[PDB]
Amino acid sequence: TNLCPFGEVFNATRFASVYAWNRKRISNCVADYSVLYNSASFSTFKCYGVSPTKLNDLCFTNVYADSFVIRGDEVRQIAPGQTGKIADYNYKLPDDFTGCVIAWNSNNLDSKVGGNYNYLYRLFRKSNLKPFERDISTEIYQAGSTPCNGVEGFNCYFPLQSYGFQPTNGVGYQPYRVVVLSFELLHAPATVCGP
Amino acid sequence: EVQLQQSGPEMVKPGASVKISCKTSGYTFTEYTIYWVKQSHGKSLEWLGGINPNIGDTTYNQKFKGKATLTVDTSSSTAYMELRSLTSEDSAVYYCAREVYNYSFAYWGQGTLVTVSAASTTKGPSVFPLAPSSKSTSGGTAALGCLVKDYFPEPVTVSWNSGALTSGVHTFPAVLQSSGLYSLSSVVTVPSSSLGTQTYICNVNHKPSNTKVDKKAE
Amino acid sequence: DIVMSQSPSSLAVSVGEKVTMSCKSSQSLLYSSNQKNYLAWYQQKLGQTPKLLIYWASSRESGVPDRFTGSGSGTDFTLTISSVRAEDLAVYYCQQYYRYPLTFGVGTKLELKRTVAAPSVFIFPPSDEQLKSGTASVVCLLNNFYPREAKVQWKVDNALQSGNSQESVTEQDSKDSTYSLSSTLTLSKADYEKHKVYACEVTHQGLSSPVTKSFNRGE
Ligand SMILES: *[C@@H]1O[C@H](CO[C@@H]2O[C@@H](C)[C@@H](O)[C@@H](O)[C@@H]2O)[C@@H](O[C@@H]2O[C@H](CO)[C@@H](O[C@@H]3O[C@H](CO)[C@@H](O)[C@H](O)[C@@H]3O)[C@H](O)[C@H]2NC(C)=O)[C@H](O)[C@H]1NC(C)=O
Ligand SMILES: *[C@@H]1O[C@H](CO[C@@H]2O[C@@H](C)[C@@H](O)[C@@H](O)[C@@H]2O)[C@@H](O[C@@H]2O[C@H](CO)[C@@H](O)[C@H](O)[C@H]2NC(C)=O)[C@H](O)[C@H]1NC(C)=O
């Protein structure tokens, strides 16, 4: 029977930058979630709402597997009710999260000698993000009262910084790929179960 | 409560240097931008630059650049301004003010006074009673005061009864007497019916000389 | 550079009525993204740090009374006090912020027109604390008068003095619009004990006949 394709989601050459975080919708299939939970590939597999120990028995309306590269320092911000540059201006999980958040170390692939500049996060945004929202915007940051006219200088900044990932870094500033399985169940027929 | 706090007025030998502070408090220092505004006596306002404490960068008014330098401290939460070569044009009152996304100057600090004088030794003011007179003979009202006479430089501050007495008080612009020092008279009207009862005291403070003297009215 | 053009330097009308001052600008203060005009209005009453009245050309800030309203766009903006008060005595700057450098206007002063009112004359003989040290300062207050104009003249034994008075004027009052004048006469321990009568003669458009307060070098 159709197996929900997590090989893409998990073993893919490139991950999106946390600011433009990526989201594939997994629907109509069976997937073993204990192919994941067993692995201990993962430095973090914290779960919120549900439980991993026997998870491939429940059925769900919708499964969203979001994925992106953050850094080790910030992994702890992809929790419910977190705050920081990521939970505020980049990727926000709700109060009522019901899913699991998986991450592993990523130097081997994403670090680079001379810094990897391809992964970007947001520095600046007017207000915070509503859960699961996603500003892909690159308009100049009005830090104060003066307008900008697409010219950046004092109090007009560019809103994205690069993570500048380097392989001999501290664990803290080392790449971490992150998959955020959000299992939500609605008032419609279910279409992911497992065994 | 947003509060900005500058320093005591200052007197600088010409061509030398000075640094004015600004202690902000009651909001996150890194978030909001500091501007500085020069208002020299008897003229209007002049913008002189900005600083953004977070990223540390500055914008400058053309005609002030070089001769002033804005410079925050993260830890103490304190904005700074340094004027390097003080001519006499620089004799003015510099403001430090904070910002909001809606408009450029939302909270203002006290004001510091900058008088640029040639080693003109700070002179404590002499304070003399302006013993009361009366409008009419049958009482009505009565007037009394304090004469602050021989001080440099300009900033003086005169209260009546440690701040108690406040209505009708009339403190006159300091005026520049031929001697080079400043002379100033703070006068207060008072109901004549009280002259024997209450005592009437004025409190004069001169920062640039630490002069805090209190004299009555005989 | 973006230089602010107010009118008119001095203004003054009586309570009630309607002051209407103006501000004009080198460059359209229009940001075509958001369609706001980048011009504020500050209310510097004397001896006080400025206070923002209108932001974005046209919006009372919180707490600002509805008799103040800004208006305009592009180049010609306008501050309008419907029914001025006593308290509305202050210099009113317009300031722009659609570009750096941030520019201020030159300033519109609001004096206040009241009804005519006569001074009050009091003479202070200089203290003895100051006499023993070596000078003599006579003071001639003129409390609570409107209009500002008043001729003060010293006489020592009916001798007009000249060239040793200074006078110091207050700002208009903010509670009933009156003035105050600080004619000070200086002499010396040497010159002051050449005489008896000291007086000051106070002409004013309220004082129908002149008034003279005076004292006798004594006790
Ligand atoms: C800074 O400016 C904002 C105005 O907001 C902006 O102005 C417009 C021209 C548009 O660009 C808007 O999209 C944009 O938000 C001041 O905002 C305050 O706005 C509200 C009006 O919506 C006033 O009361 C509030 O009303 C909402 C409901 O609509 C309530 O939830 C609020 O709790 C509050 O009651 C408020 O009066 C107004 N502020 C003032 C001072 O009038 C913002 O206050 C302003 N900041 C400063 C320091 O002036
Ligand atoms: C992700 O891949 C692993 C391992 O596959 C290897 O590594 C990949 C990155 C790629 O280079 C492959 O060609 C490699 O062969 C998968 O691990 C397999 O898992 C099953 C079940 O757990 C196990 O029986 C196999 O022995 C494993 N293979 C190896 C080589 O260890 C893993 O399942 C993939 N993840 C997902 C979610 O599908």
Numbering used by the authors:
A (entry chain A): 333 to 527
B (entry chain C): 1 to 218
C (entry chain D): 1 to 219
Provide the authors' own sentences about this structure as they appear in the paper.
Spike (S) protein, the main focus of vaccine development for severe acute respiratory syndrome coronavirus 2 (SARS-CoV-2), contains 22 N-linked and at least 2 O-linked glycosylation sites per monomer (1–3). These sites are important for S protein folding and processing as well as for evading immune recognition by shielding specific epitopes, thus hindering the efficacy of the vaccine. In addition, a broadly neutralizing monoclonal antibody was identified from SMG-immunized mice that could neutralize wild-type SARS-CoV-2 and VOCs with subpicomolar potency.
(H) Epitope mapping by HDX-MS of m31A7 is shown in a time course revealing two peptide candidates, 419–433 and 471–482, with greater than 10% ΔHDX at 15 s. The footprint of m31A7 on the RBD is similar to that of human VH1-58 class mAbs, but it approaches the RBD from a different angle, with shifted local contact areas on the tip loop, bypassing most of key mutated residues of VOCs such as E484 and K417, but not T478. (L) A footprint comparison of COV253 (pink) and m31A7 (green) on RBD (gray) shows similarity, with residues of VOCs labeled and drawn as red spheres. The detailed RBD-m31A7 interface and the inhibitory mechanism of this SMG-elicited mAb are under further investigation.
